[PDB]
Design a protein around this nucleic acid. Structure first.
Ligand SMILES: [K+]
Ligand SMILES: [K+]
Ligand SMILES: [K+]
Ligand SMILES: [K+]
Ligand SMILES: [K+]
Ligand SMILES: [K+]
Ligand SMILES: [K+]
Ligand SMILES: [K+]
Ligand SMILES: [K+]
Ligand SMILES: [K+]
Ligand SMILES: [K+]
Ligand SMILES: [K+]
Ligand SMILES: [K+]
Ligand SMILES: [K+]
Ligand SMILES: [K+]
Ligand SMILES: [K+]
Ligand SMILES: [K+]
Ligand SMILES: [Mg+2]
Ligand SMILES: [Mg+2]
Ligand SMILES: [Mg+2]
Ligand SMILES: [Mg+2]
Ligand SMILES: [Mg+2]
Ligand SMILES: [Mg+2]
Ligand SMILES: [Mg+2]
Ligand SMILES: [Mg+2]
Ligand SMILES: [Mg+2]
Ligand SMILES: [Mg+2]
Ligand SMILES: [Mg+2]
Ligand SMILES: [Mg+2]
Ligand SMILES: [Mg+2]
Ligand SMILES: [Mg+2]
Ligand SMILES: [Mg+2]
Ligand SMILES: [Mg+2]
Ligand SMILES: [Mg+2]
Ligand SMILES: [Mg+2]
Ligand SMILES: [Mg+2]
Ligand SMILES: [Mg+2]
Ligand SMILES: [Mg+2]
Ligand SMILES: [Mg+2]
Ligand SMILES: [Mg+2]
Ligand SMILES: [Mg+2]
Ligand SMILES: [Mg+2]
Ligand SMILES: [Mg+2]
Ligand SMILES: [Mg+2]
Ligand SMILES: [Mg+2]
Ligand SMILES: [Mg+2]
Ligand SMILES: [Mg+2]
Ligand SMILES: [Mg+2]
Ligand SMILES: [Mg+2]
Ligand SMILES: [Mg+2]
Ligand SMILES: [Mg+2]
Ligand SMILES: [Mg+2]
Ligand SMILES: [Mg+2]
Ligand SMILES: [Mg+2]
Ligand SMILES: [Mg+2]
Ligand SMILES: [Mg+2]
Ligand SMILES: [Mg+2]
Ligand SMILES: [Mg+2]
Ligand SMILES: [Mg+2]
Ligand SMILES: [Mg+2]
Ligand SMILES: [Mg+2]
Ligand SMILES: [Mg+2]
Ligand SMILES: [Mg+2]
Ligand SMILES: [Mg+2]
Ligand SMILES: [Mg+2]
Ligand SMILES: [Mg+2]
Ligand SMILES: [Mg+2]
Ligand SMILES: [Mg+2]
Ligand SMILES: [Mg+2]
Ligand SMILES: [Mg+2]
Ligand SMILES: [Mg+2]
Ligand SMILES: [Mg+2]
Ligand SMILES: [Mg+2]
Ligand SMILES: [Mg+2]
Ligand SMILES: [Mg+2]
Ligand SMILES: [Mg+2]
Ligand SMILES: [Mg+2]
Ligand SMILES: [Mg+2]
Ligand SMILES: [Mg+2]
Ligand SMILES: [Mg+2]
Lengths: 45, 271, 93
RNA sequence: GCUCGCCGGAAGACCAAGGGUUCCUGUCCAACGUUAAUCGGGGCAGGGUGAGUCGACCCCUAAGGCGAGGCCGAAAGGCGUAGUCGAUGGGAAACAGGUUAAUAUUCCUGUACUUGGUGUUACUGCGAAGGGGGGACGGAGAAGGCUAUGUUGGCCGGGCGACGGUUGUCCCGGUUUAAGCGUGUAGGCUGGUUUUCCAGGCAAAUCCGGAAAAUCAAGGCUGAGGCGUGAUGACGAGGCACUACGGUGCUGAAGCAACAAAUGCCCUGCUUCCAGGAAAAGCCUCUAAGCAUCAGGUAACAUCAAAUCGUACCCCAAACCGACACAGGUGGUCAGGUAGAGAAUACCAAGGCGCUUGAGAGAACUCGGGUGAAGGAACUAGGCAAAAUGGUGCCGUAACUUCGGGAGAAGGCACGCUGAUAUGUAGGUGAGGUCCCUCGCGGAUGGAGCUGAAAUCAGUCGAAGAUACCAGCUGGCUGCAACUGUUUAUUAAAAACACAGCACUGUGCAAACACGAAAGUGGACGUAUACGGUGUGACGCCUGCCCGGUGCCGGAAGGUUAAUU
RNA sequence: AGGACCGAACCGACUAAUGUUGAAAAAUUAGCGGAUGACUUGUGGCUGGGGGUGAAAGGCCAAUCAAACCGGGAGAUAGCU
């Protein structure tokens, strides 16, 4: 059966990538939270 | 001509077609075409703002001359064409100077007929004049509401306006709605009625024919749940409320015009 | 024209393998490890200057580094650039 | 290694997406592998991805995104102009053969092609952010011409048979060759050329559009395939010689014709229909400012350049999505033989596999199947399930009907093989030969050869000839819904939803209405034969009485009545 | 010609049996419906939570839906166990 995750790198990057995060205040707050938590991987990029 | 399809299948039994042999079978005039991609009735917020719009055939936009302001230069009708963007047919016209334009095709207009616009044009179908220069009692179409703005009234297939009176700077028009409206006498109009009056005799015949025209299904309020529509709900077919729109406004008689700016121009409402 | 400083950094090592040995004997082609950012033009110039031979053509590829377990921890070797440098017929490097 | 079995419009082959070394070689067997494992997609190490032409990048745009100024908004922000991004679409160019353990249109061999830079010669109005052309477009259908491809013959090489026969009307195999360059054919489209003039193409124009004469009748554009060359080459059945028996080396005959033939190509065509079928650049052409014997343009010639990134491997799957080496899911391309209408189905080819526990036994019971005396729905909530019907041709076919239907109604007959008609017919294809020729890839003619149904008559085997696989059960009465559609992903597919049709009602355009503190946007580049809302639901015959209640519409005298004063 | 007919691919999901610590958190097998259209499918895009989208089932919005998910108010409150 067709499951929910149907990977596409283009859609992944456009939806959740670094530049998508940087494009809005709320996306930049995601990056701020993840840097503050000390995440090794900030985004899907 | 109005042609009834033979009932060779249940989707054909009720079809009534308007078949016009005068219309150009070839492609339209490419310099007067533009793309017009579809909306699905969605605005720039991406939200449906008009329900029941979607799909249907791809259509190119024909640039139609509603202004008719190329005055004093005769034009000859080259051919009548199907226009998917409107109920009326259009006419490709060639001016003496070599310019081509599209116009709304009036009743009776055929290839080879001569037309002209301006103050000194003849009172003949397809000629455009200021309504100051058109006799009272005349049948006109493509009527401007402001001078130079381009025709906005009586553009649909078979429609027309009657100039009932002339009073100083204004003319009184009887519109197809039955409304009596004042318009400035400097506003242009084209003599005659819009052609293709048989348009209203078509019978689509099947669901799919509406879908081809980009009309999506209407779901009745009473078929829904209360959460979706005021009419929703009931164990079985129930109603028991005054009919309303999906947004709760009475939909059987309640007047919705509210334009104090334009009230002065309305002599008599359609009633 | 490329500066000599640049040319002295583009060639990293000869690449030793069965395919490299066969390339030399059959097609007069030397196989080199080169700087990751080296272009075909830079490799050609560097080989002609430093090895004193005449180069016909340079073909290049990027070798992607292997992922490798050292104990438990996962690591990755570096990507590197390989150059197949075809010499003219009678050069004999 | 031999045999057996299974797939073969796939369980083969090549990819995109996704994955990321799983690829190849050596080595190891703890763990992983539902068992053992010497094996592995497992561990460890080493190797492996070669491009002017394939793809990305790049030029160009779609939906849409972002958006200098701008407009709007307590702030955050929203919208949007100029622009700038954005492929799933448009835009230059390479083929065949050979080669690695593992890449190859990338390496090698042979033979090509494209774009741009610089110079040399010649001739020469070049010049855009502008104009015009072009690019540039739908559905269905029909037929002709072809090719891929197949079959048969010829040719060449080999064979003479484990058991009766097999020197032939015998058996097996091969019979392949590209892009490019040249030629211009079946077919498709269109009348040419010249002169003069002009309110149009934001200005100009020699271009496009328009007008008027002159003149001639064949001019131009497009185009599959074929043919020639590419090719005195490459490939080649096999033979010979080695092997480190995995694989190499050596050498190599014929390499033709006829017939059949696509869903591929001519064809972005043609015919036809209504629901009326992207954009922008490259490209061609026109000039403006400008430069003006300079730059620039044009062609040939020479020379230089074409970077960078991807390229292994899986890819209907043990490598992707499903926690698994999971009976699931996953877009594109290729399309052999016999039978067949067929991409169904059966059996096969190329190729790929036997599904990572086996060995016995032959109880009940369960699962999946086969057959069944007599009976034949007695079963059961219900013929649930099963059994049955099933093909082609011809004959024949009721009520009712909206005249289409109902209908494949129902029901019935024929069907294999052999011979003859006819040593293979009707039809299709079409060589040599002959004839003509505004001269070719040409007609007129001719039927050699090839292919080839269908029918009739006669005979003949079986219980049975649509023999397997495959493949409608049929009829009668009635409720509901007109119909095709749609729906509760995962217990409901229906009488529910939708529907064409009908009606009421709103809406005069800065429309009503909707999204939005707003700007705006949709409605619509629509305009009352239009658009929104509501109910009803094809069609036929129709749709009665009630305005007291609640709503809506109109009224506006009188009563009552807010802020305010 | 056709929301025409029979029927593969393709799209569905009417019946039955199996399976129900499954081979599978919805399938398999035999049958079944549509199959030029109101068809189906690839890639990309847009609509956002009292919000969307809905040929309308309160259906669907990442195995979640009469108000998604994540974090926070937060140790909500719990005359109840
Ligand atoms: K409805
Ligand atoms: K109701
Ligand atoms: K909802
Ligand atoms: K109800
Ligand atoms: K109900
Ligand atoms: K074992
Ligand atoms: K390249
Ligand atoms: K690049
Ligand atoms: K024998
Ligand atoms: K080529
Ligand atoms: K050729
Ligand atoms: K490769
Ligand atoms: K792939
Ligand atoms: K019935
Ligand atoms: K159903
Ligand atoms: K009343
Ligand atoms: K909510
Ligand atoms: Mg509507
Ligand atoms: Mg129309
Ligand atoms: Mg329209
Ligand atoms: Mg309706
Ligand atoms: Mg309901
Ligand atoms: Mg309510
Ligand atoms: Mg009731
Ligand atoms: Mg009641
Ligand atoms: Mg090379
Ligand atoms: Mg490369
Ligand atoms: Mg590994
Ligand atoms: Mg391996
Ligand atoms: Mg084990
Ligand atoms: Mg052991
Ligand atoms: Mg391994
Ligand atoms: Mg290319
Ligand atoms: Mg845009
Ligand atoms: Mg914006
Ligand atoms: Mg700004
Ligand atoms: Mg761009
Ligand atoms: Mg693309
Ligand atoms: Mg390989
Ligand atoms: Mg078409
Ligand atoms: Mg052929
Ligand atoms: Mg012989
Ligand atoms: Mg014998
Ligand atoms: Mg033979
Ligand atoms: Mg087809
Ligand atoms: Mg590969
Ligand atoms: Mg297994
Ligand atoms: Mg699997
Ligand atoms: Mg599929
Ligand atoms: Mg076959
Ligand atoms: Mg099959
Ligand atoms: Mg048994
Ligand atoms: Mg049993
Ligand atoms: Mg049985
Ligand atoms: Mg019995
Ligand atoms: Mg018996
Ligand atoms: Mg019996
Ligand atoms: Mg009986
Ligand atoms: Mg009975
Ligand atoms: Mg009984
Ligand atoms: Mg009983
Ligand atoms: Mg049954
Ligand atoms: Mg059965
Ligand atoms: Mg009853
Ligand atoms: Mg129905
Ligand atoms: Mg149905
Ligand atoms: Mg369900
Ligand atoms: Mg169901
Ligand atoms: Mg507006
Ligand atoms: Mg109803
Ligand atoms: Mg049908
Ligand atoms: Mg469904
Ligand atoms: Mg099934
Ligand atoms: Mg049917
Ligand atoms: Mg069917
Ligand atoms: Mg309910
Ligand atoms: Mg869900
Ligand atoms: Mg709530
Ligand atoms: Mg609190
Ligand atoms: Mg608590």
């Amino acid at each position: 059966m067709k499951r929910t995750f149907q990977p596409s790198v283009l859609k992944r990057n456009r939806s959740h990538g670094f530049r998508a995060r940087m494009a809005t205040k709320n996306g930049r707050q995601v990056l701020a939270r993840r840097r503050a938590k000390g995440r090794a991987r900030l985004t899907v990029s | 001509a109005v042609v009834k399809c033979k009932p060779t299948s249940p989707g054909r039994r009720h079809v009534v077609k308007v078949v016009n042999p005068e219309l150009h079978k070839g492609k339209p005039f490419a310099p007067l075409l533009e793309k017009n991609s579809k909306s699905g009735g969605r605005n720039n917020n991406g939200r449906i703002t008009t329900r029941h719009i979607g799909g249907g055939h791809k259509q190119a936009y024909r640039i139609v001359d509603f202004k008719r302001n190329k005055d004093g230069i005769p034009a000859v009708v080259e051919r009548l064409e199907y226009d998917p963007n409107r109920s009326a047919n259009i006419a490709l016209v060639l001016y003496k100077d070599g310019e081509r334009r599209y116009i709304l095709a009036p009743k009776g207009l055929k290839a080879g007929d001569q037309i002209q616009s301006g103050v000194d044009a003849a009172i003949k179908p397809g000629n455009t004049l200021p309504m100051r220069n058109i006799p009272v009692g005349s049948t006109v179409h493509n009527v401007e509401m402001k001078p130079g703005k381009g025709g906005q009234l009586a553009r649909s297939a078979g429609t027309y306006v009657q100039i009932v009176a002339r009073d100083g700077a204004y003319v009184t028009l009887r519109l197809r709605s039955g409304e009596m409206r004042k318009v400035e006498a400097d506003c242009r109009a084209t003599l005659g009625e819009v052609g293709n009056a048989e348009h209203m005799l078509r019978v689509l015949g099947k669901a799919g024919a509406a879908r081809w025209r980009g009309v999506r299904p209407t779901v009745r309020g009473t078929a829904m749940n209360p959460v979706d529509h005021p009419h929703g709900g009931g164990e079985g077919r129930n109603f028991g409320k005054h009919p309303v729109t999906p947004w709760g406004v009475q939909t059987k008689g309640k007047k919705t015009r509210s334009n104090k700016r334009t009230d002065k121009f309305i002599v008599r409402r359609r009633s | 024209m490329i500066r000599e400083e640049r040319l002295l950094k583009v060639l990293r090592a000869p690449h030793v393998s069965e395919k490299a040995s066969t390339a030399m004997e059959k097609s007069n082609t030397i196989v080199l490890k080169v700087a990751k950012d080296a272009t075909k033009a830079e490799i050609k110039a560097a080989v002609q200057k430093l090895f004193e031979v005449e180069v016909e053509v340079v073909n290049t590829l990027v070798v992607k580094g292997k992922v490798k377990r050292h104990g438990q921890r996962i690591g990755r070797r570096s990507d590197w650039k390989k150059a197949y440098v075809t010499l003219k017929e009678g050069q004999n490097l």
